[PDB]
């Protein structure tokens, strides 16, 4: 997530061209997906791996 | 209908009367009073009495409280030095789950450590509330100075034992005294068939005789609590008959002869011999009565006097001299018949309420195992003679005394100048 | 008449202790409330006597003497 | 004689907030950034006050 | 099989890092209301052991160090002491929620 | 599932009229404060001031 | 004694529909 | 046999009227004992501020001797037959009751008639009892909840005959004489205001015959042709504070105007009062109590006790709560009690409604178990309702009560209403009337 | 009003140790009046003692005839001047008293202590009697404390008798307390909860053997030497010397020299010791017990 | 009570801080422990530490001649009332011949006490108390017992 924030800062750096289109789009989608979906799923499987339920 | 008894061969007594009452009312009576503790587990009976709403093996504390209050019933524990009674009240529709809760509480308690640690403060509050009345303090001090081992254990947990009663001690007490040979299941407004079924499928795990308590031993003596109150309380008793005796009936007749409470609101108690004897020479307010407490081991009979600080000696001496006159033979057959009528009326007025009837059937089932109808009790009270009353008064006069006093005891006499 | 209530008329709720673990539909008279009872002071614990040699001399043999002072600790003499 | 630090009202608020505050003993250098943000805010207030003095 | 899962759980237990501070899984459980109820329901010796382990872990984190590899707790010796108390507290809370819903 | 149940459903049913009246209060206050044309050019009296 | 406590006269402060102690309230509480 | 069938199996009360208008009622049960009582429509609502304690003196002096039995002969006869003789006086009713055996019914009825209609009031007894009521009023103000109930009645019914207590003031106790007592006796002890109620092993025909023998032509004549009318009492929202900080605990009672005896909303208000309930430190329910007010009280250690009451008089009443609490929790208990009241007003739910219905059924049957409370219910029911309402009818009304009805009646009798507040003791934190009323509404309904 | 809190704190500190409570209870059950009044204020009387009560007590008991002004290291003339300057405005003999009638009896306080403290006493002589001197010699014969730190108390008869049949920590001694009109002599035992009955019975049997006459003249001489040494080291300290001369001035009104005190101690005979032991055996008993009293015997069981 | 001449005792009574405190000077061969020991509740340890250290530095910085005379009288009474008695005399003889090599007489002790005045009390207290690293021992509910750095910061003053 921190790396993706660095990518987003960089992509805000250079203007909106190729391949910055797809790099910024994938960076934003991955950023939202990590902060919404991936982290709670990781916590759930982490609790399962530590045998909490 | 009529009351019917059965004896389940593990020692259990089942009592049922289907009177088609709107509220079914079922009690379970255990011989697990305060007399069954010794010096190492004092107050276990108090914590067990206050521990009726804890987690059980089949129902949590939350489930018990919320279910009983949702069906509108009630659960109460009435404990004396001999016995404990666990009583549930409710509509006949909810009596199945009421019996489920009652038998779970009486037979399978979890007794968790945190729950009893929370209950200890409630125990201290209950003791303070009960000792807001000085009569309880005087009577328990009287029991403590009168008995040595068994009945000297108080109904409330001592202040040192507050905090040191353990779940292990509670479990030991329940496993050693909540036993089928020492329990009776009594129901009013419930069927004998369903009572037998619930007793069978909640009473198939304990069937011994239980731990045999020690016999009570008398010691006598006087103890005094100087607390500076304007009213001096003094109970002077002596050893009397155990319950279930013709001489115990004679002691009850003597108690109602000497005065066993007021019959007229704001009355003068003009037929009470103790009240007349005190009022012949006292102008300040007083309250003198005859105290009678019988248990299956032994009894205590005497006089209870609430008086002023200055007039305590006169009140106590007048009451004691009245009992000495009764022992010498200063009584009349009309007074004996009036005492008998008062005793019969009091017994029937105790029976006429559902609580008193349920307690009477439970105690009779515990002590004898067979129901004794009120007509036979009335016949025995009629068969009590005046010579038996004279013998009972002579026994109280000749026997050594136990005095419990409290108040401003500057003018309260001791035992050796009575 | 084999019951404490049937034998002792006015002494029934004195010889008997009733506690309702679940509150009933009807409340009784004289609900009762403790008047915020005070606490004994927090004070030092005395050493125990786990051996006979330290236990010796602890038995009282003379009457009490209570000594107080302006700037000396209060002493109890047996 | 009284303890002025925990008796005076402003002083006791300062003492309970910043002086005698029970803090975790093991917080790393990442816990300095709140005070760094406060100091940065004060520095910004002063520098911008002078910039607006001449702006 | 179960053996590979146990080995991978051992590797994750080493990778988690709370064994290097002498902690346990129940020690590193976050204190919610149910967890606090479990700690208050704990006996005295287990309470003292847990609080000392937490204090030692805080001291080690303050010094930015870990225990020696001899003194690391093992995956086989990780006692699940808070599990029954926590399960009972969750059961009581679910019973209360069901009664409130009905 | 804490808020899903029959008691919560009927509590919500009791609170629908109050919440709806509060929403009406908020809507009327919003139109009155902003002087919204799309609503205020239908009531009879307030039509006069916009001409 | 506590029964000697009498609430004093408030007729110089009461409203017009509350002055009469014989006439009951709750037909004028809505109006007030 | 279910609850309805058992309630139908409860026997009916026979009511008959004598020639003079005295109402004779009985309920026959299988008990070997019985209780017989005379209920008289008399009390503080009929006392007119000059004879303010007259009923209380007559209750004191009824058992001290009659014309037929001078001195203590009445007490001797009652204690010889083994009966228990009791009396009480509310603000509207006066009761003289005897509990005895079934075979002593003629003697009990004759003694009751001699008590009621032939009281002898000798001046030595007047003076001795004057000292007796002075001592008993001192002991009554020693008690603390009676003081608060008297204060609540005074501040809720000020300017009306319901403000005054049953005992009356000490100056009235000192100055009223035998003439005023006999005037009260010859005014308020008429035949149409008396009920001879019997319960237990009593035959209605025998009770009727004994009433015709003894209670026939008791007064029947007002001697001035001026029947006193019972005017309505104005309820005013108000607040009385007896601050005395040396007392250990604080007693606070908050009430509103009730509907009265004849209103059918008493069942619904009793259901609501069963939902809120009662609590004291003796209860072992703990945090698992169903009532939210007692659950909050045990969770926060707020109060020592609280109770909900619904006192009813002729087309009026006091509906509310009374709590004993420490001086540092009065505001919290007022806030939580008002929140529970307005929760019943707005969003009372079916589960607590049926819980309160079951509690009310158990309370009614548990009260009506026993000969003395059955006779008390018979006498009070004939004096208030004019009839004895059976438990089947009570259960029918209880089943008629549901959640929407409960919240409607609670909104009618509680929501945005001016209360009566009576505080006694360290009540500094007890909020003012403005904050209490502001708690007696919500800004979100 | 500010001092009554200090009164409560002082009573708590005094009741830290169990011997104070035991002997307060012992006096309470040993006397009807005039000596059963507790040395510390009762909890009910706390908060209710008033300035007029203090003034009444001072004006009735702080008089000139009930006072003695003693002084070490000061001039007799200076003491005379300060006495005639401060103490001429007090009345006289004041209130008499109530003669301290005996009652006997017992109380038992179960408080769950690890050790059981039990004192069993009976009436004895008052200050100023050869019987009281015999009781003091009897106390030092039976054991009035340890003469050796961590010792076995070899010449102590009760310590020997209890150690003959016990293997638990114990401490048994003889309690003697004489006053102006009455005395209390008895046995004090601190024992285990289980062995309390055996310890008390062994102590009582030892005293009964002494009463029967099982004692030697050498042990009587050793007891007299112990008593003389204890008196001399009591007088040794200047504070103790001041206390002794003041107590003598209050009681007898004249100073008795330590040579005369040792002379009368030597004049105590052994038959007088036997008579004192027989008096304690045959007298009515006052018992104060506390601890875990599941095995402590009662007075009729002795 | 509150009117005690000792200011630490006076503030302890006034604020109800500690159950008790005492001061000790234990001496061994060219060493010793000199300080104060107090028992208090769990909510007064920091206040008692602050007040005791403040009194120590008041002695260090601003010593008063009248209070020094009070202490000298107290100390004279202490030695003579201790030496009243044969077994404390024998105890002092043993300690004196084992430590000093001789028995210091009461006249010599009084001469040294007379030599003591406020100025050298100030100098000696500043030498032994001021800005010295202490030994702290706590047993019990000592969570409010301050940190060692706070105790050192009490051991030096910023106004002197
Ligand atoms: C809340 C959102 C709607 C607010 C609004 O339009 O209010 C109408 C009023 C007036 O709207 P109006 O109907 O006069 O037209 C303004 C809108 N245009 C020009 C785009 C058609 O708007 C405001 O007061 C602005 C509120 C902004 C928040």
Curated annotation (Swiss-Prot), chain F:
Q: How does it sit in the membrane?
A: Single-pass membrane protein
Q: Mitochondrial intermembrane compartment: which residues?
A: 37-51
Q: Which UniProt keywords apply?
A: Electron transport, Membrane, Mitochondrion, Mitochondrion inner membrane, Respiratory chain, Transmembrane, Transmembrane helix, Transport
User: Mainly resides where?
Assistant: mitochondrion
UniProt record, GO biological process: cellular respiration; mitochondrial electron transport, ubiquinol to cytochrome c
- Locate the transmembrane regions by residue number: 15-36
**Could you name the domain of life of the organism this protein comes from?**
Eukaryota
Per the record, its GO cellular-component terms are:
mitochondrial inner membrane; mitochondrion; respiratory chain complex III
Mitochondrial matrix face of the membrane: 1-14
- Where would you find this protein in the cell? Mitochondrion inner membrane
| Subunit structure as annotated in this protein's UniProt entry | Component of the ubiquinol-cytochrome c oxidoreductase (cytochrome b-c1 complex, complex III, CIII), a multisubunit enzyme composed of 11 subunits. The complex is composed of 3 respiratory subunits cytochrome b, cytochrome c1 and Rieske protein UQCRFS1, 2 core protein subunits UQCRC1/QCR1 and UQCRC2/QCR2, and 6 low-molecular weight protein subunits UQCRH/QCR6, UQCRB/QCR7, UQCRQ/QCR8, UQCR10/QCR9, UQCR11/QCR10 and subunit 9, the cleavage product of Rieske protein UQCRFS1.
Give the protein family.
Answer: Belongs to the UQCR11/QCR10 family.
The UniProt function text for this chain reads:
Component of the ubiquinol-cytochrome c oxidoreductase, a multisubunit transmembrane complex that is part of the mitochondrial electron transport chain which drives oxidative phosphorylation.
What is this protein identified as? Answer: Cytochrome b-c1 complex subunit 10
Species for this entry? Mus musculus (Mouse)
Task: Give the source lineage, highest ranks first.
Answer: Eukaryota, Metazoa, Chordata, Craniata, Vertebrata
Encoding gene (name):
Uqcr11
UniProtKB/Swiss-Prot annotation, chain G:
What would be the name of the gene that encodes this protein? Uqcrfs1
**Functional note:** Component of the ubiquinol-cytochrome c oxidoreductase, a multisubunit transmembrane complex that is part of the mitochondrial electron transport chain which drives oxidative phosphorylation.
Q: What is this protein called?
A: Cytochrome b-c1 complex subunit Rieske, mitochondrial
Q: Which residues lie on this side of the membrane: Mitochondrial matrix?
A: 1-32
Which organism's genome codes for this protein? Mus musculus
- Quaternary state and partners of this protein? Component of the ubiquinol-cytochrome c oxidoreductase (cytochrome b-c1 complex, complex III, CIII), a multisubunit enzyme composed of 11 subunits. The complex is composed of 3 respiratory subunits cytochrome b, cytochrome c1 and Rieske protein UQCRFS1, 2 core protein subunits UQCRC1/QCR1 and UQCRC2/QCR2, and 6 low-molecular weight protein subunits UQCRH/QCR6, UQCRB/QCR7, UQCRQ/QCR8, UQCR10/QCR9, UQCR11/QCR10 and subunit 9, the cleavage product of Rieske protein UQCRFS1.
* Full-sequence range covered: 79 to 110 of 274
Swiss-Prot record, chain I:
Q: How is it modified after translation?
A: Acetylation of Lys-8 and Lys-99 is observed in liver mitochondria from fasted mice but not from fed mice.
**Any single GO CC term annotated in Swiss-Prot or TrEMBL for this entry:** nucleoplasm
Q: How does it sit in the membrane?
A: Peripheral membrane protein
Q: What is the lineage of its organism?
A: Eukaryota, Metazoa, Chordata, Craniata, Vertebrata
What keywords does the record list, in alphabetical order? Acetylation, Electron transport, Membrane, Mitochondrion, Mitochondrion inner membrane, Phosphoprotein, Respiratory chain, Transit peptide, Transport
Please give the organism.
Mus musculus
Gene Ontology molecular function terms on file: metal ion binding; metalloendopeptidase activity; protein-containing complex binding
State which stretch of the full-length protein is shown: 152 to 453 of 453
Residue numbers of N6-acetyllysine PTMs: 48, 99
Q: Where in or outside the cell?
A: Mitochondrion inner membrane
Under the subunit heading, UniProt states: Component of the ubiquinol-cytochrome c oxidoreductase (cytochrome b-c1 complex, complex III, CIII), a multisubunit enzyme composed of 11 subunits. The complex is composed of 3 respiratory subunits cytochrome b, cytochrome c1 and Rieske protein UQCRFS1, 2 core protein subunits UQCRC1/QCR1 and UQCRC2/QCR2, and 6 low-molecular weight protein subunits UQCRH/QCR6, UQCRB/QCR7, UQCRQ/QCR8, UQCR10/QCR9, UQCR11/QCR10 and subunit 9, the cleavage product of Rieske protein UQCRFS1.
What is the protein name for this chain?
Cytochrome b-c1 complex subunit 2, mitochondrial
UniProt modified residues of type Phosphoserine: 217
Function of the molecule: Component of the ubiquinol-cytochrome c oxidoreductase, a multisubunit transmembrane complex that is part of the mitochondrial electron transport chain which drives oxidative phosphorylation.
Q: What is its main location?
A: mitochondrion
SS bond list: none
Report the superkingdom from the record.
Eukaryota
Q: Which gene encodes it?
A: Uqcrc2
UniProtKB/Swiss-Prot annotation, chain J:
Q: Where in the cell is it found?
A: Mitochondrion inner membrane
Q: Which residues form a coiled coil?
A: none
Name the organs or tissues of expression. Expressed in neurons and astrocytes of the cerebral cortex and hippocampus (at protein level).
What biological-process GO terms show up in the record? cellular respiration; mitochondrial electron transport, ubiquinol to cytochrome c; mitochondrial respiratory chain complex III assembly; response to activity; response to alkaloid
GO cellular component terms attached to this protein's record: mitochondrial inner membrane; mitochondrion; myelin sheath; respiratory chain complex III
Effect of gene knockout: Results in early embryonic lethality.
**Does this entry carry the keyword Phosphoprotein?**
yes
Q: Which UniProt keywords apply?
A: Acetylation, Electron transport, Membrane, Mitochondrion, Mitochondrion inner membrane, Phosphoprotein, Respiratory chain, Transit peptide, Transport
Q: Which GO terms describe its molecular function?
A: metal ion binding; protein-containing complex binding; ubiquitin protein ligase binding
| Family listed | Belongs to the peptidase M16 family. UQCRC1/QCR1 subfamily.
Q: What does this protein do?
A: Component of the ubiquinol-cytochrome c oxidoreductase, a multisubunit transmembrane complex that is part of the mitochondrial electron transport chain which drives oxidative phosphorylation.
- Protein name per its UniProtKB record: Cytochrome b-c1 complex subunit 1, mitochondrial
**Organism per entry:** Mus musculus
Q: Report which part of the complete sequence is shown.
A: 321 to 480 of 480
């Amino acid at each position: 997530l921190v790396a993706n924030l660095l990518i987003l800062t960089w992509i805000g750096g250079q203007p909106v061209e190729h391949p910055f289109i797809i790099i910024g789009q994938l960076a934003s989608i991955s950023y939202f997906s990590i902060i919404l979906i991936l982290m709670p799923i990781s916590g759930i499987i982490e609790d399962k791996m530590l045998k909490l339920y | 209908q009529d009351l019917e008894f059965t004896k389940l061969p593990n020692g259990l007594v089942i009592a049922s009367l289907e009177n088609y009452a709107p509220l079914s009312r079922i009690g379970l009576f255990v011989k697990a009073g305060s007399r069954y503790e010794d010096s190492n587990n004092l107050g276990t009976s108090h914590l067990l009495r206050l521990a009726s709403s804890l987690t059980t093996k089949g129902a949590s504390s939350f489930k018990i409280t919320r279910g009983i209050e949702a069906v509108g019933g009630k659960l109460s524990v009435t404990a004396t030095r001999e016995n404990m009674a666990y009583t549930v009240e409710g509509i006949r529709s909810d009596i199945e789950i009421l019996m489920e809760f009652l038998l779970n509480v009486t037979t399978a308690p979890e007794f968790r450590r945190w729950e009893v640690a929370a209950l200890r403060s409630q125990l201290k509050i209950d003791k303070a509330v009960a000792f807001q009345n000085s009569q309880t303090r005087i009577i328990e001090n009287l029991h403590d100075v009168a008995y040595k081992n068994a009945l000297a254990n108080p109904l409330y947990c001592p202040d040192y034992r507050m905090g040191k009663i353990t779940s292990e001690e509670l479990h030991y007490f329940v496993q050693n005294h909540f036993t089928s040979a020492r329990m009776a299941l009594v129901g009013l407004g419930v069927s004998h068939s369903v009572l037998k079924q619930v007793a069978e499928q909640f009473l198939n795990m304990r069937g011994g005789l239980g731990l045999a308590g020690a016999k009570a031993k008398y010691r006598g003596g006087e103890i005094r609590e100087q607390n500076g109150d304007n009213l001096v309380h003094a109970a002077i008793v002596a050893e009397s008959a155990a319950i279930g005796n013709a001489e115990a009936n004679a002691f009850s007749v003597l108690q109602h002869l000497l005065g066993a409470g007021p019959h007229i609101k704001r009355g003068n108690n003009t037929t009470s011999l103790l009240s007349q004897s005190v009022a012949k020479g006292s102008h300040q307010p007083f309250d003198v009565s005859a105290f009678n407490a019988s248990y299956s081991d032994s009894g205590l009979f005497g006089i209870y006097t609430i008086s002023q600080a200055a007039a305590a000696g006169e009140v106590i001496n007048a009451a004691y001299n009245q009992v000495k006159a009764v022992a010498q033979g200063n009584l009349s057959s009309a007074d004996v018949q009036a005492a008998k009528n008062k005793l019969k009326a009091g017994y029937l007025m105790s029976v006429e309420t559902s609580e008193g009837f349920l307690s009477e059937i439970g105690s009779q089932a515990l002590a004898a195992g067979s129901y004794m109808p009120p007509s036979t009790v009335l016949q025995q009270i009629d068969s009590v003679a005046d010579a038996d009353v004279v013998k009972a008064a002579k026994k109280f006069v000749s026997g050594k005394k136990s005095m419990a006093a409290s108040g401003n005891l500057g003018h309260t006499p001791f035992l050796d100048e009575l | 008449m084999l019951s404490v209530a049937a034998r002792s008329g006015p002494f029934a709720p004195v010889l008997s202790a009733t506690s309702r673990g679940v509150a009933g539909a009807l409340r009784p008279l004289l609900q009762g409330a403790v008047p915020a009872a005070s606490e004994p002071p927090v004070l030092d614990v005395k050493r125990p006597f786990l051996c006979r040699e330290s236990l010796s001399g602890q038995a009282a043999a003379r009457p009490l003497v209570a000594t107080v002072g302006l700037n000396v600790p209060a002493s109890v003499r047996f | 004689m009284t303890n002025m630090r925990k008796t005076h009202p402003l002083f006791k608020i300062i003492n309970h907030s910043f002086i005698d505050l029970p803090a975790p003993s093991n917080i790393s250098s990442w816990w300095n950034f709140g005070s760094l943000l406060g100091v940065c805010l004060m520095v910004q207030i002063i520098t911008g006050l002078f910039l607006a003095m001449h702006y | 099989s179960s053996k590979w899962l146990d080995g991978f759980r051992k590797w994750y237990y080493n990778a988690a890092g709370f064994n290097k501070l002498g902690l346990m899984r129940d020690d590193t459980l976050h204190e919610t209301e149910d967890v606090k109820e479990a700690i208050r329901r704990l006996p005295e010796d287990l309470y003292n052991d847990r609080m000392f382990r937490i204090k030692r872990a805080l001291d080690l984190t303050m010094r930015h160090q870990i225990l020696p590899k001899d003194q690391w707790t093992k995956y086989e010796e990780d006692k699940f002491y808070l599990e029954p108390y926590l399960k009972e507290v969750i059961r009581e809370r679910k019973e209360r929620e069901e009664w409130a819903k009905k | 599932s804490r808020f899903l149940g029959p008691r919560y459903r009927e509590l919500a049913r009791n609170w629908i009229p109050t919440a709806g009246m509060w929403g009406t209060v908020g809507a009327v206050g919003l139109v009155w404060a902003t002087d919204w044309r799309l609503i205020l050019d239908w009531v009879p009296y307030i039509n006069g001031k916009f001409k | 004694s506590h029964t000697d406590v009498k609430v004093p006269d408030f007729s110089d402060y009461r409203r017009a529909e509350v002055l009469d102690s014989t006439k009951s309230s709750k037909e004028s509480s809505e109006a007030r | 046999a279910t609850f309805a069938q058992a309630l139908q199996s409860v026997p009916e009360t026979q009511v008959s009227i004598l020639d003079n208008g005295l109402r004779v009622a009985s309920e026959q049960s299988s008990h070997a004992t019985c209780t017989v009582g005379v209920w008289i429509d008399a009390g503080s609502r009929y006392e007119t501020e000059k004879n303010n304690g007259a009923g209380y003196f007559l209750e004191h002096l009824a058992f001290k001797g009659t014309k037929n039995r001078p001195g203590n002969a009445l007490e001797k006869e009652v204690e010889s037959i083994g009966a228990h003789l009791n009396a009480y006086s509310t603000r509207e009713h006066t009761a003289y009751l005897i509990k005895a055996l079934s075979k002593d019914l003629p003697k009990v009825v004759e003694l009751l008639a001699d008590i009621v209609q032939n009281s002898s009031l000798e001046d030595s007894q007047i003076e001795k009892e004057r000292d007796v009521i002075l001592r008993e009023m001192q002991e009554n103000d020693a008690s603390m909840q009676n003081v608060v109930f008297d204060y609540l009645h005074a501040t809720a019914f000020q300017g009306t005959p319901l403000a005054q207590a049953v005992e009356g003031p000490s100056e009235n106790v000192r100055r009223l004489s035998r003439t005023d007592l006999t005037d009260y006796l010859n005014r308020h002890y008429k035949a149409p205001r008396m009920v001879l109620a019997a319960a237990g092993g009593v035959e209605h025909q025998q009770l009727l015959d004994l009433a015709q023998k003894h209670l026939s032509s008791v007064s029947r004549v007002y001697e001035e042709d001026a029947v006193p009318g019972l005017t309505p009492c104005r309820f005013t929202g108000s607040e009385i504070r007896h601050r005395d900080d040396a007392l250990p605990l604080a007693h606070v009672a908050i009430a509103v105007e009730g509907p009265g005896w004849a209103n059918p909303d008493n069942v619904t208000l009793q259901v609501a009062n069963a939902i809120i309930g009662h609590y004291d430190c003796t209860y072992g329910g703990g945090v698992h109590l169903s009532s939210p007010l007692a659950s909050v009280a045990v969770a926060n250690k707020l109060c020592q006790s609280f109770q909900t009451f619904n006192i009813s008089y002729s087309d009026t009443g006091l509906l509310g709560a009374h709590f004993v609490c420490d001086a540092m929790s009065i505001d919290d208990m007022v806030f939580f009690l008002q929140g529970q009241w307005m929760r019943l007003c707005t969003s009372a739910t079916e589960s607590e409604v049926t819980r309160g219905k079951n509690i009310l059924r158990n309370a009614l049957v548990s009260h009506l178990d026993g000969t003395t409370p059955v006779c008390e219910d018979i006498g009070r029911s004939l004096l208030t309702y004019g009839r004895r309402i059976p438990l089947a009818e009570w259960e029918s009304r209880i089943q008629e009560v549901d959640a929407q009805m409960l919240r409607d009646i609670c909104s009618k009798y509680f929501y945005d209403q001016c209360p009566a507040v009576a505080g006694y003791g360290p009540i500094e934190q007890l909020p003012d009337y403005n904050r209490i009323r502001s708690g007696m509404f919500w800004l979100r309904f």
